[PDB]
Symmetry: C2
Subunit: 459 residues, 2 copies
Amino acid sequence: NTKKILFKNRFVILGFGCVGQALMPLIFEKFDIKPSQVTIIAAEGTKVDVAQQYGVSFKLQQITPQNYLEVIGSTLEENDFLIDVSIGISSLALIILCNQKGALYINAATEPWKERRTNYSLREEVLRLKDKTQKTALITHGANPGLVSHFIKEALLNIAKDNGLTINRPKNAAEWANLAMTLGIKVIHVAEQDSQVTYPPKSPGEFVNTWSANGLILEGLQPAEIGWGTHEAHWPHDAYSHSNGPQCAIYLSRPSAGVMVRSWTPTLGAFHGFLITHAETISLTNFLTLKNGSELLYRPTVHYAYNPCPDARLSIFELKSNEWKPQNKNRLILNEIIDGCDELGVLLMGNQRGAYWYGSTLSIQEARQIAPYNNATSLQVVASMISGIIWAIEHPDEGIVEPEEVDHQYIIDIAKPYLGKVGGYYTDWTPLKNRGELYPEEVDLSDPWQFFNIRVNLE
Amino acid sequence: NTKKILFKNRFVILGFGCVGQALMPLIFEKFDIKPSQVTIIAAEGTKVDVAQQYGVSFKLQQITPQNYLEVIGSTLEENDFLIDVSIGISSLALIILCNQKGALYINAATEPWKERRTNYSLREEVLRLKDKTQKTALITHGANPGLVSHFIKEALLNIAKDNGLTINRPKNAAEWANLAMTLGIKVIHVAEQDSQVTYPPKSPGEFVNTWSANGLILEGLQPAEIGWGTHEAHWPHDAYSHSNGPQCAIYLSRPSAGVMVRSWTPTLGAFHGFLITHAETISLTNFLTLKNGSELLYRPTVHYAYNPCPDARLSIFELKSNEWKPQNKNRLILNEIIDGCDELGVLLMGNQRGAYWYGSTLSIQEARQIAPYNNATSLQVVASMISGIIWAIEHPDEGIVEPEEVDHQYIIDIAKPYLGKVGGYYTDWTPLKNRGELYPEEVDLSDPWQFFNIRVNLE
Ligand SMILES: NC(=O)c1ccc[n+]([C@@H]2O[C@H](COP(=O)([O-])OP(=O)(O)OC[C@H]3O[C@@H](n4cnc5c(N)ncnc54)[C@H](O)[C@@H]3O)[C@@H](O)[C@H]2O)c1
Ligand SMILES: NC(=O)c1ccc[n+]([C@@H]2O[C@H](COP(=O)([O-])OP(=O)(O)OC[C@H]3O[C@@H](n4cnc5c(N)ncnc54)[C@H](O)[C@@H]3O)[C@@H](O)[C@H]2O)c1
């Protein structure tokens, strides 16, 4: 362990689900810590023996607004680290508490107390505390949101070198936005394709996924969310904006799981992914926005193009089939998967060099030799977190920070050993070619990167 | 073999694909015939040893318009039987030829010479030969079209007894139509749900199905075909009719594989099937039509509500994903399926007793103990054919006949031992209940059996 980071404090992880269990291995792999320096608090037990294998204390308790101050508060000392991988617990409340205790904090997503509140408010509510806390609190730092932000910056620089351009690594958001515009980026996709298959096959009455079934279901139930790029010359018939909501975002009536978009992945290529909504859509869009003051000049279109594992495809199909009524049973496929991989990455379109995709292609085989209690999907998420956790430790006083404010190279260099083959790929693909002729869909030959061409319109 | 039918002639089967191979077992199971009394002609060989196991001659040859008269003609003697289970060969041409040779004939679907010609013309072209040939030629007599017609008549009678009504088994079409109307049948669905799963999982780049991948693909590519019932009070926005085409049919712009309809099956229940087009839609509709002369009085809505095996679901998904470009590879799942069943049947809606579903629920396990080279799907198709073949032998001089003109009880009693559990099921289900509320779809509370409520409208 020549790279084993020394840690004299303790790790308090609340929640022990899909993410939490998969994190365990990476913590003891990167830290020369004792199991006694780790404690877990969760509301529901588990049929898994992860905690027992590592010998980490596990407390069965439900965290509420009435007891979190005492239960969680009495567990954090100055310099401790609260790894938040729970659901239904106020990130805002936990963040403030950590600051008071002088403890570090991280999460893979901003969450409110268990009770439909917009994903916008939740972020602004906690973001409007930038200059209030001192201790570092890294938010929404998972594979995506999270790692994805670091992939965009990496790609932005690679495309620059491949264009002959030679500049300095940008610092502020404005410079990053400027580099995006100078490169002709009209649209950025978070293009992922999960090909993990399993055995035995799927059974009726259950939602099967490589990660939280409820997370996917909830996201697919909400209306399509899209960062509107300044190049867009067409307005979706079923689209609408919020006068007071985010100025950069546009929404669609239909549920995100009911909207398909044309994207691209290196391993399989052109495909139709679900335009599943996400948090880092508005944050990334604004991060790459440009203006002279109160007049926007540039802004790319940003949204998710997801294609889950075949089992999750069958699940969504069954979900709609049940009139959007979620199956009475959920299942996380881990050991049952026998083959496949997860291609998570970002697609930047617009530059003359051609569409560019930079990301991680991790197979289940490599993921299993790298760490237990992990599949291709989970491993990419915890790889990002363990990196973010290490970042916060050597930068404990940065206040509330988002992945966009973190140096991509630092994170990528730590996570890379956990992401299988990672790199960029150029392609001459566009949503305008390989088109069919059975049913001619109206297209805009003028600019292939128009949402009008990407969205799969039934009519 | 106390029920082994004696046959002194020969069986000429052209084509040896999904259906043909699966038929072999049933022929030697129901006939005390010698293998020398069987001959097979097909264009493509096979990696299967079905012919070799039974010791039946196999001739590798492509049948064309220029050689069919000699190749096929020299193989048929008076009273012989040509089992047509090929593709791309003119049924009309084969039918006439058989008559000239005084040989019997049967097929599971009407086909033209290999070359997009409407399914309507093909039927009328051959149907306009009713009083021209003497020898019996049973057409479109597979599971569906075919067995399905016999299930409708069976259900029609069962609902009558369950209604207290006591009449005589109707003969002509008018009487059958009349019974349908007197029973309040507003809509009839061919509701099927294939749950056969497999191992190993599906691979990218291939269309996997329990039956012909190309058959499903072709059907899903054509526009939705629907028998318009007289009760329908709503007109689909994307619908249209053919002034000269079939008066009872209505079409939809979108491809059939792009239209979902709400139906019901006993084993799983309410589901969303693909409104895949078929042949027996127009024939059944007219068969249940009523009028005083030139003014229609009654006619139910008739269409298919199909839900293929999960692998075929993933296949269709990938098909659309490839812009309707069929995968470069096709695969028929037979031995790889490990569990599941095929629920093929008909749903009659409108009667006060409630929706009624009568059909066959055959599992892969029962199908394997019943016959080799068969899965749940194939077995239901060949069960119908072997029954139809037996029918034609004792009725060799009936001319061109359709399954609607055949006594359902005769067929059902022969096939029943091949269909697993077969029977009727009542249900209080309607496309109006168990509805969701996330996205309220406009419905007509006045009459749940309105196509307006059954078709899953995205908006
Ligand atoms: N950025 C990414 O790539 C990414 C990927 C996956 C998940 N996530 C985020 O990670 C999360 C972590 O959850 P997960 O996916 O493992 O879900 P999960 O539902 O599998 O586990 C959540 C755990 O939190 C606990 N929790 C819920 N209520 C609690 C309560 N009252 N008291 C104490 N603990 C409670 C549960 O008991 C459970 O063990 C979510 O917030 C999700 O949005 C981010
Ligand atoms: N009613 C039903 O439930 C039902 C179900 C399935 C299939 N069918 C019908 O059955 C059919 C039989 O085909 P299948 O599904 O086995 O398809 P298939 O493609 O698997 O096999 C068809 C066979 O026909 C042969 N054929 C094609 N061209 C030929 C030529 N030029 N000369 C000689 N033979 C030729 C092929 O070589 C092949 O072996 C189709 O017509 C289909 O519509 C009906």
